[PDB]
Design a protein around this ligand. Sequence first.
Ligand SMILES: CC1(C)C=C[C@]2(C(=O)O)CC[C@]3(C)C(=CC[C@@H]4[C@@]5(C)C[C@@H](O)[C@H](O)C(C)(C)[C@@H]5CC[C@]43C)[C@@H]2C1
Ligand SMILES: CC1(C)C=C[C@]2(C(=O)O)CC[C@]3(C)C(=CC[C@@H]4[C@@]5(C)C[C@@H](O)[C@H](O)C(C)(C)[C@@H]5CC[C@]43C)[C@@H]2C1
Lengths: 813, 813
Amino acid sequence: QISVRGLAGVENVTELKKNFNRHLHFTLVKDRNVATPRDYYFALAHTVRDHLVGRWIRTQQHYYEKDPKRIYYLSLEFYMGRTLQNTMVNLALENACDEATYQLGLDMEELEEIEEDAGLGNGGLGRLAACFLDSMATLGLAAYGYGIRYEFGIFNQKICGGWQMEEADDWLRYGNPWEKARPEFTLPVHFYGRVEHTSQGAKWVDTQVVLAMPYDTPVPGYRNNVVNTMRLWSAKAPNDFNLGYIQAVLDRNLAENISRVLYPNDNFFEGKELRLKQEYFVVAATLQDIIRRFKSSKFGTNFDAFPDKVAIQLNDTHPSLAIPELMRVLVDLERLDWDKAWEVTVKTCAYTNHTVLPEALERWPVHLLETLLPRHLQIIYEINQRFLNRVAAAFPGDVDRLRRMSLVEEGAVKRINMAHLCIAGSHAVNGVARIHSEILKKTIFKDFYELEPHKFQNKTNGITPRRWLVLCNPGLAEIIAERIGEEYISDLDQLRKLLSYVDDEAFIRDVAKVKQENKLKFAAYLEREYKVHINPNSLFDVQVKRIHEYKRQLLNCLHVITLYNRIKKEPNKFVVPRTVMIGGKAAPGYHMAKMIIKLITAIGDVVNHDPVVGDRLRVIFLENYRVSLAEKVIPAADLSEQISTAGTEASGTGNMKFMLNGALTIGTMDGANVEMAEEAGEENFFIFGMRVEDVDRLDQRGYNAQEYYDRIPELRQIIEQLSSGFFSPKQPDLFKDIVNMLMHHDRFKVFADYEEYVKCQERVSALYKNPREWTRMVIRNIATSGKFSSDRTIAQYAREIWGVEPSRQRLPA
Amino acid sequence: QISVRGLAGVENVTELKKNFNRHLHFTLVKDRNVATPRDYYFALAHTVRDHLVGRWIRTQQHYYEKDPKRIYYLSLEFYMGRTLQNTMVNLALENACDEATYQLGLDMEELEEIEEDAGLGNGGLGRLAACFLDSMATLGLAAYGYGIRYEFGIFNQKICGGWQMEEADDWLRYGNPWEKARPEFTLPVHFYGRVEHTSQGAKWVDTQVVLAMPYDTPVPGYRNNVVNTMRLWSAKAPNDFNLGYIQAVLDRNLAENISRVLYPNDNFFEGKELRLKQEYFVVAATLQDIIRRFKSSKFGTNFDAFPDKVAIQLNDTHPSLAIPELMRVLVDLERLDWDKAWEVTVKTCAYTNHTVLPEALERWPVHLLETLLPRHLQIIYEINQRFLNRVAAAFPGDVDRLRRMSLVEEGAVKRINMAHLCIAGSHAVNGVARIHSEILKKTIFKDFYELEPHKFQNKTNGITPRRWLVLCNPGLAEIIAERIGEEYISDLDQLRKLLSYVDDEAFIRDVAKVKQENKLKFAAYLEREYKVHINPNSLFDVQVKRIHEYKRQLLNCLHVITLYNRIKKEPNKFVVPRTVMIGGKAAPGYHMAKMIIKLITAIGDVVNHDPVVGDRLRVIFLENYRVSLAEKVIPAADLSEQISTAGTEASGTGNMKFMLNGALTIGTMDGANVEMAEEAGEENFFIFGMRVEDVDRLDQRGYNAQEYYDRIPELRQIIEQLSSGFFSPKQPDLFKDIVNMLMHHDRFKVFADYEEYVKCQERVSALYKNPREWTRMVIRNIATSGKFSSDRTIAQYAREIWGVEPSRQRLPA
Ligand SMILES: CC1(C)C=C[C@]2(C(=O)O)CC[C@]3(C)C(=CC[C@@H]4[C@@]5(C)C[C@@H](O)[C@H](O)C(C)(C)[C@@H]5CC[C@]43C)[C@@H]2C1
Ligand SMILES: CC1(C)C=C[C@]2(C(=O)O)CC[C@]3(C)C(=CC[C@@H]4[C@@]5(C)C[C@@H](O)[C@H](O)C(C)(C)[C@@H]5CC[C@]43C)[C@@H]2C1
């Protein structure tokens, strides 16, 4: 049908159709008279999965022969989304299967919509991992994704009377065609017990055993025949478990709870024991697998070559226990002396920090570690002690530095700072955008940077152009391909060539037309699936991301109410019509975040039913935001909101998704926004609000919100409406908490940016009135988004941290 | 290789080999360099399963077209054992796959040994169900097996210092290739709640919902292309379950515990709530499925035809709740009047009693039923009341009859007698052997028989000749086939033709040779898998079945000790050498049964290491007795022990397995022993001990064990040895409980049969000295075992209870 989707070549179409029928019959045990669309999905899924395995086997074959350095990406989250289309695309099968399914009387797109999201993550951190795996495969790196196979992913969000309800994401109900259970490689993991000292050294004894069973999922590279592995561990009870009888068998559930459910906190730390167990579980199983693989390799007892053969990347502090666990194995099991083991550990591990928010930082209570992991606690003390000896030696007399740098935090309950552990035990520590990396150096890890400056790097985040362009936006990918060819899909810098088309009249019409189709398509998705009626000619103003105070959905809310109040004030004035879409999940415990969601719908309730407004203003809350909903809403977006207070959003990746897809960005000078504007030029970006410097200036002086309430009558009016019950007529004081927080304890200075934000929003409206100039700015954005490809990011990790060469070369089919 | 295993025909062998390689590669994602025997097993398993599905689909197709009466076999137990060989045999694939696997360099027999037993039963009751399913398929009946898919079957038995240890039977670890999950047909099951009365009638409200997910396993007929279904329900939590958040997700385990584990009691009732839940769970899910299927059928709102289209067979009282549940649906949901519903229910249900032991009878406490199933309790009272009105009317004034017959038992805690429910609500009640059926009529259900004599029948149990001859004993099947052909495999009465070979010299040599090969093979299994050394020229004296007081493993123990004491008394006298093998599992709580096991090994410890004994006497305890171990030990057996006290073993099925396989039987006139001896003639059977009449005579008089201790010096000596610590030198009084029970509270009169048993054992030894005459008696046994085929049994159920015609006709391939 369209060029980028591949060859639909007769002999391949025939082979596909017959394998579809073979799976329908033998695998699913059905026929055409009974098969539901779900059965049809599975037949396709199994048929496509078939094409993977041959390559999967020869890829792992290759790595065995060549024995290259191996990359191990440890993450507690892998937000994969759907796998079918991504697989077809990466294999060049997309038009073949479209033809095959057409000739069978099936609509492939209808089938695609049946697949559950692998929602094994919360937001940015988890999706980054997913993007990374794709880029690592595409660059032919010998890489593995290691995590946990949660039985329940991020909860499904339902809105009831404008309130969020969580329900279990039972994503495995119908089965996962993509995974292969590998029970034969199950590994023991130990908990509790105590430490015994001998002449032979320390011994960890009297432990409970939980078994860790791996599941492998194939990770296909883009058209290169590389298929890497994502290995996810599942928790199983041993067979002599507790072994009156009935109860013994039922209590097996306690061990298996470890891998039951993903913790649903985005950028927030809850010190629960179950969470610590998940963390040790993934770390212990993964390290044995790594060591096992290292010994059984075509090479040469000798752990000196270990850092030459192994890289372990820590995705935030969640797998930080890899560090003391590696020491434990090296020292206690393999009998290496402390100092050699430590050199091996440091040269093996690297750490990626994802946030500077204090409440997101993992600080584990000592007493928890003492009970659960007594040996690791000892190792931690020993690590800490030796480290402080290095600090004392470099900065003699500096006693305050000593306590500031300690891995052990004093106070009512002693804590272990896991970020500090990671810095001390890694050869590389990186931020996820230039500004965030600088903030690490200048503020929260200043002490560590002074000690070991050579350890600190930047790796600006990226996204994958396969999922985030070719897959979710075939129309835009096609029109780009018509002009510049196809090579940009694995080399996105080539989008610069599109600058020489900024004045081309046909291309302008094409860009604007693709946007309009996406908007029509999404407006139709809203109708059929949620019975909501939007005008597709309005500006699509969207903020999608996890609900959080720092992300400032509230700032958006205030602008929305302002537009509403202006319309009501002068009903017959012309205003550029908008559809404001806000979506995202709140963590179950986060009360404030739940209130914000309630507000947004409360606003929608007043605004969407005011006849005076007409179709000039609509406020819609997007239920159950997740990867596969991002794939739909992002292509449809005109305005992207990235309005976090400066200094709080480490990078952001959504921002990049909207850039790649023809939305213009309204944002603060925060995270990767700074680099995005730098790439596109500040004239092609709606930048407003305080810079990092302005925030600090405001903090020393002290932030008084009352001041803004006093001087801005439009703001005073909104605050009065909130308090008086305008948006909650039955519960007049429903929103007292929000007003109270805004006035007296607002850590994120919503008011300080209000004026500059509303004015900047007027500038956006101005540009949208001139369709041609909007689209030319859009072209300037899309054409300079090259830098934000995860291929670039990964190539940087590969060369500057792991020491391996990215290859773009095919493997034989 | 051997004739009965089918055609190994070139084109089929080629097709098999290529499908093996396809599964190894695509399904298992392996290759020849990494594949372990387990992977090889799975490749075979998937390859064989492929041949089933085509037939499975056209079988269910056929039943849809023809719409015959459907048989629903409800059981809480289906003791299936292994499925691979049974599948190959029933499909005529056995030599083809042997050839195919040979040409691939694999030993098929080694592969077969990798398959786990489906140990979803305890003993006789569960294996009967398995035999039945095979016979029902073989006779082309439109039949379904309905039960629970337990995550853990009967525990694996380990012996540690001669004591039984239970460990979890984790039979699903590597997956079950045979089942197909059918999540799309999940059904709601309700618990707790309360009853609300309206004008519209009763309403069951405020219930907890547990979901029931079906798994289908194919049941192939013998060479007839019929493939029936066994549907097993699995327990799943609903998605709004409890829906702080984490705990809500973890508590989903509570709902799913229902299908977690099989209760390990053979012939014993434990009134636990979890057990009641399993019982209602299988009953509720199964009845909705039945009703659903009935409405969606090529026929015609109208439940009058229900008994013409549906038969529900209750396997013991465990699914007895089918009766009030059917009423509930009919009355409360479909709005039929009580009397019509009741007529429909009675004509639909039939009940099979499996034991007369009082402690095996299900009597549920009212308060449990009130909380868990309040509506069913009401229905039960209403059933009871109307029934007692029929009793009062037929026997006016008989007030004691009234209370004796009540479904409701008075006393400290009120109970519901489920056997009484089953009798009242079924059109047919059957015992499982002629004597047991008579006992039902004359004693425990005498009152019910007087009221409705037409309701009581016999259906003597049977076993399947496919598993129990062709599969476990190919050598014996072959030599029979040489003489009389193959038709006997689905018409076992034809074994009578073998009587005209009782004097044939070649056949005698063949029978004795097959026995000798089986004995050599089993002696080799003992060495390699358990390092135990047996003389294969000795008499193989075996008692395998669940450990129980009534089964009288103790009587055997006493004979064993007697033989030992006689040898020791006259060391240089000749004695016919024996290997005594005893095996079977004890229920975890049953303390006595565990002591018996300990004794047997304690005896082995003294006897097996006495140099004076030599290899004349060996006592071996067979660890982990289960279906696949029965398949090995039974063909190897010379003497079969069926020595339960008369009146206690309802039928027995092991007895029949040994008869079919060339063992002679030493037994009491109990259960099916009576019919076996009748078929073979009492001269061809070692019958000893009290008859039923003699037991009753002893009971009125009163059973004084002291009397036998006083008059039999050989018995006194054994009791002194037990007490003095002869078999437990470190723990002199270890066996006080057994001696004490034997002397003062022996319900099973072990001593009363001792004299007659030992003397009869001498007669067996006498015959074994004459190899030729042994084998001729063996031939007389094997040749008259026709009656004990489950095909006969099922044909009797079909014609006399269900009203359907067994067919032997093929369906097209
Ligand atoms: C070290 C062990 C025991 C545990 C972990 C393993 C791993 O690396 O993941 C498990 C998987 C295998 C068996 C493993 C190694 C190589 C094969 C291989 C690539 C071998 C190749 O000959 C074979 O031709 C193929 C089939 C390509 C295999 C694939 C499987 C692996 C990678 C290890 C085995
Ligand atoms: C009543 C329903 C909704 C629930 C229970 C069912 C049952 O009888 O087990 C579920 C299974 C199906 C769909 C069922 C009926 C027929 C098919 C069929 C035999 C139909 C035939 O055309 C089809 O050609 C085949 C494929 C032969 C099917 C097989 C499956 C069944 C038996 C019912 C469906």
